[PDB]
Design a protein around this nucleic acid. Structure first.
Ligand SMILES: [Mg+2]
Ligand SMILES: [Mg+2]
Ligand SMILES: [Mg+2]
Ligand SMILES: [Mg+2]
Ligand SMILES: [Mg+2]
Ligand SMILES: [Mg+2]
Ligand SMILES: [Mg+2]
Ligand SMILES: [Mg+2]
Ligand SMILES: [Mg+2]
Ligand SMILES: [Mg+2]
Ligand SMILES: [Zn+2]
Lengths: 102, 144, 55, 139, 139, 71, 129
RNA sequence: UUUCAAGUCGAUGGAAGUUUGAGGCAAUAACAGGUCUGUGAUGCCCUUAGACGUUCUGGGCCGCACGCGCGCUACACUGACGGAGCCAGCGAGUAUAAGCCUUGGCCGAGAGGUCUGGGAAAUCUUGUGAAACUCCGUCGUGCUGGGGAUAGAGCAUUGUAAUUGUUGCUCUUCAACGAGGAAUUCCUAGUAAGCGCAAGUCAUCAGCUUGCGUUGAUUACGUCCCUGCCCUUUGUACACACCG
């Protein structure tokens, strides 16, 4: 449980906090002499829901088109597991959730 | 594989199973005039009888004509699949059959009274001449 | 006796097998992404859930 | 060695052309261009060849990989990748005087040899089966 | 010379002739009865040779790819079904015909069951197909 | 009213070899139009006449066969 | 057409269902009988018979045992009109709900293999004018 | 060209020169427009134990002398089949469940079955090897191999349950229709038209919608002649505003 190629997967709805955490981790992986791979921009997923405007069934056939973009980024680090987890607490953000896989 | 000629051997009108067949139609599609014989069925009896499909009806000799009517009357004896047959798992004797020109409407009729005699729902609507398989009749089938 | 008859008919894989989260309706349900919400309840909660109109 | 890699595009079809120094190998997805299946359009990919003269391809070999789009849309993507690859090779490994000469003949014949068509499919709008078409109205 | 250097349409007509003249391919007994797809309405018009030509297409199609399954072969040769009044739809081909061809072809050679699914082309499969390409283009 | 002939007798056969050469342009429809033979019979006649050298193939296609006289 | 044969013989006609005559038909277990009828019937018995069809057969059997001067075996009424007629229940009379009334049907031998509710139409026929 | 102004029309360059294409949002008031059949949103009236509450069983919403609207197949050869060639994009996907997408192998003419494995997903289904399309053949102007209703018999899937055939497959049966009166709809560029594919509904069922891509045009780029709306002037005994 020393050095470890560790993958961190980042998913969120908003890109500013995703890129701030991504850049902050990359920045912290720079002053610490840790070789890094990323961030990798995964193809964004557009969750689309198209309903009818009318609560009843009358009028011109008009539709709403709601959207929910999901952006996913993975960053590869070469560091021991204790080091990577404390970086996550440094760059904790309410919007972005974090999962760590070895 | 070339144009060939013949004289006096062509037969303009054939009579098979008491049905008149035009002799200048290709054999695979000429036999479809016989009721109970579709395009799919005519393709196989010609191939089981070693009658190449490139021949018109009148081109055939008597030996081939009897060989075809023999196969149609005895399909299972010539490796014709059961699922390929017209009337399989027959109602009365339970064997696989293929009814033909002067027999199809007889057993189709016998099926109708067999439906009407038991007074099934399907048999009643057949008597009225309406659709029996649940089709809507509100807005379709208004001719006479 | 009665307990074996009351509410005995199966209520799975049907439209009555599910209901709206909000109004417990059976018609116009949305099952995409496991929403399980009526189309009318979705509109009044879409902004809260995170669905916005862009195009 | 002297290798340049380019791409041409149509609606969705994209053909990636690799132009290396060699004997003049010109293949479509690993197959010679003499056997494109849109036979009626075989001269669309022959146009970038016969316009300049086959002598220009002696020193270069071209291998393209075309994916996406449709049968016709792939042909226009391929012919663009070939035309752009020849120009990009001259600009990098030959004098620019020759590159401007080649670019002149292609453009004077058909703009789509070098310039990608910007047309994309219009989105469909509700109330009709197409982008502009609408459901038949009744009174 | 390779398979990719010869037109596909007249290569299959040449490989079909060899497989029939070679005679070693085992032909199932229902080839004169069955239709290729549930979407088809009639059996093949080339009763004596259709199985050979289809096996030639399957062998040639597998040559250019990696671990294609038998389910994918049904989709490839399937077409639009003629639903009477309902709109047309794509329907897969018959499973037995495709599975029998590759199985018949496996003890005659050219293919074998590949790792991670599908059916690869055999060590000898490249050797004899590339041969057929050469005896295709001498005319 | 068509009633095109589908069986080739001898009177029409030598009439064909005497008339087809004296045509500016022969095709599947030309044989049907003027010789009163059927379309299928027209297709086999063209494929043999080319092998016998009387007819030169201008263009080859499944749906259209463009032929001309060879003299 | 080779010829035209028309012989036929009087083999002492008795009702037969798919090669099995009435004498043997009646004394078949329903497990054996279902093996020679249509696909829909064969699927239904493999899917498992719930208690309702099995309970009705027992009552239909008892109703026949009620009378032994050989007259009609009295009626058992039921809502389960998805019942498949079996040779065991030939001659019994059942009242099958059509939503409002108990339509009375007599199980003829030729009715076998059909749905029990198929002989009690659920709608009164339309009559214009 | 123009009041030399706002602008407009041509070229050149340009990826893009129609607001670059398309949408989302969208003013001041208003309609007795539609919904209390989306709401544990509601006021009032009715009912409230033989319920108009709720539940079980079965049927109906599909019922058929008829008129009308939104559509799908077609009336053939610029085509049907039979083989062969073989290219997209938008998306979705599960656990002790109550069962998701399902490749690959093995059975089956098919529909489909079975055994394993991958995927909570740019990883696997999936390059969704889609259909039109292209090539080579059969057909040959024929209600014909166009067209596939109607019906008989049989084989599977889902579901407690398929009868009033859920749907799929096999054989047979093969009807009107031979391009459609008066009228009337949509549409200006990757547009119209075809052509399929995905998502929604969904245990099963898409001739329906919402989108997506493949092939891909003719003809204006003008006017107020018809039709609708807006503005100005005008008349008014209307202002609950001509439904006066
Ligand atoms: Mg009755
Ligand atoms: Mg499959
Ligand atoms: Mg095909
Ligand atoms: Mg007689
Ligand atoms: Mg505009
Ligand atoms: Mg009920
Ligand atoms: Mg509408
Ligand atoms: Mg075709
Ligand atoms: Mg299931
Ligand atoms: Mg006006
Ligand atoms: Zn709701």
């Amino acid at each position: 449980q020393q050095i470890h190629k560790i993958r961190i997967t980042l998913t969120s709805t908003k890109v500013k906090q995703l890129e701030n955490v991504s850049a902050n981790i990359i920045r912290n992986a720079a002053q610490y002499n840790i070789v890094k791979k990323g961030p990798v921009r995964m193809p964004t997923k557009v969750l689309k829901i198209t309903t009818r405007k009318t609560p009843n069934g009358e009028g011109s056939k008009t539709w709403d088109a709601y959207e929910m973009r999901i952006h996913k980024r993975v960053i590869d680090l070469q560091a021991p597991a204790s080091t990577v987890k404390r970086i996550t607490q440094i760059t904790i953000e309410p919007g972005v959730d974090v999962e760590v896989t070895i | 594989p070339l144009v060939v000629q013949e004289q006096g051997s062509f037969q303009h009108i054939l009579r098979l199973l008491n049905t008149n067949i035009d002799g200048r139609i290709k054999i695979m599609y000429a036999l479809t005039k016989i009721r109970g014989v579709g395009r799919r069925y005519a393709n196989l009896v010609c191939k089981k009888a070693d009658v190449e499909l490139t021949k018109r009806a009148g081109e055939l000799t008597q030996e081939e004509l009897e060989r075809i009517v023999t196969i149609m009357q005895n399909p299972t004896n010539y490796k014709i699949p059961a699922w390929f047959l017209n009337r399989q798992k027959d109602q009365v004797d339970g064997k696989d059959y293929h009814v033909l020109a002067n027999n199809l409407e007889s057993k189709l009729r016998d099926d109708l009274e067999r439906l009407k005699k038991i007074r099934s729902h399907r048999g009643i609507r057949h008597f009225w001449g309406l659709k029996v398989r649940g089709q809507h009749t509100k807005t379709t089938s208004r001719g006479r | 006796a009665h307990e074996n008859v009351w509410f005995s008919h199966p209520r799975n894989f049907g439209k009555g097998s599910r209901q709206c989260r909000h109004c417990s309706s059976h018609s116009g349900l949305i099952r995409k992404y496991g929403l399980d919400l009526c189309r009318q309840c979705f509109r009044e909660k879409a902004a809260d859930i995170g669905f916005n109109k862009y195009r | 060695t002297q290798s340049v890699q380019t791409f041409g595009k149509k609606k969705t079809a994209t053909a990636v052309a690799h132009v290396k120094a060699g004997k003049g190998l010109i293949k479509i997805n690993g197959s010679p261009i003499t056997l494109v299946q849109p036979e009626i359009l075989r001269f669309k990919v022959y146009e970038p060849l016969t316009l300049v003269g086959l002598d220009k391809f002696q020193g270069i070999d071209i291998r393209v990989k075309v994916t996406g789009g449709g049968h016709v849309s792939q042909v226009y993507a391929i012919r663009q990748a070939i035309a752009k690859g020849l120009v990009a090779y001259h600009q990098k490994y030959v004098d620019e005087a020759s590159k401007n000469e080649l670019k002149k003949i292609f453009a004077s014949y058909d703009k789509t040899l070098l310039v990608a068509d910007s047309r994309r499919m219009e989105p469909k709008k509700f109330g009709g089966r197409g982008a502009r078409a609408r459901f038949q109205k009744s009174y | 010379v390779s398979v990719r250097d010869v037109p596909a349409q007249d290569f299959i007509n040449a490989y079909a002739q060899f497989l029939q003249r070679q005679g070693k391919l085992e032909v199932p007994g229902y080839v004169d009865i069955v239709k290729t797809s549930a979407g088809n309405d009639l059996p093949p018009q080339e009763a004596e040779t259709w199985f050979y030509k289809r096996a030639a297409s399957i062998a040639r199609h597998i040559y250019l790819r990696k671990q294609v399954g038998v389910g994918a072969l049904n989709k490839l040769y399937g077409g639009a079904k003629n639903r009477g009044f309902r709109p047309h739809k794509h329907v897969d081909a018959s499973g037995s015909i495709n599975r029998k061809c590759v199985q018949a072809l496996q003890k005659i050679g050219v293919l074998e069951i590949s790792p991670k699914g599908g059916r690869r082309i055999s060590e000898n499969g490249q050797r004899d197909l590339d041969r057929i390409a050469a005896q295709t283009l001498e005319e | 009213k068509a009633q095109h002939i589908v069986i080739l007798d001898q009177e029409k056969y030598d009439r064909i070899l005497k008339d087809v050469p004296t045509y500016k342009y022969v095709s599947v429809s030309v044989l049907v139009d003027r010789l009163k033979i059927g379309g299928s019979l027209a297709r086999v006649a063209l494929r043999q006449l080319e092998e016998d050298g009387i007819i030169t193939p201008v263009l080859k296609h499944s749906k259209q066969a463009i032929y001309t006289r060879a003299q | 057409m080779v010829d035209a044969t028309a012989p036929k013989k009087r083999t002492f006609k008795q009702f037969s269902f798919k090669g099995v005559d009435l004498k043997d038909l009646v004394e078949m277990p329903t497990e054996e009988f279902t093996k020679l009828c249509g696909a829909r019937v064969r699927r239904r018995f493999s899917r498992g018979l719930d208690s309702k069809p099995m309970g009705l057969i027992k009552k239909l059997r008892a109703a026949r045992a009620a009378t032994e001067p050989n007259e009609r075996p009295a009626v058992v009424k039921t809502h389960l009109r998805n019942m498949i007629v079996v040779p065991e229940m030939i001659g019994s009379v059942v009242g099958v709900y059509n939503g409002k009334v108990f339509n009375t049907v007599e199980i003829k031998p030729e009715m076998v293999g059909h749905y029990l509710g198929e002989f009690s139409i659920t709608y009164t026929p339309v009559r214009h004018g």
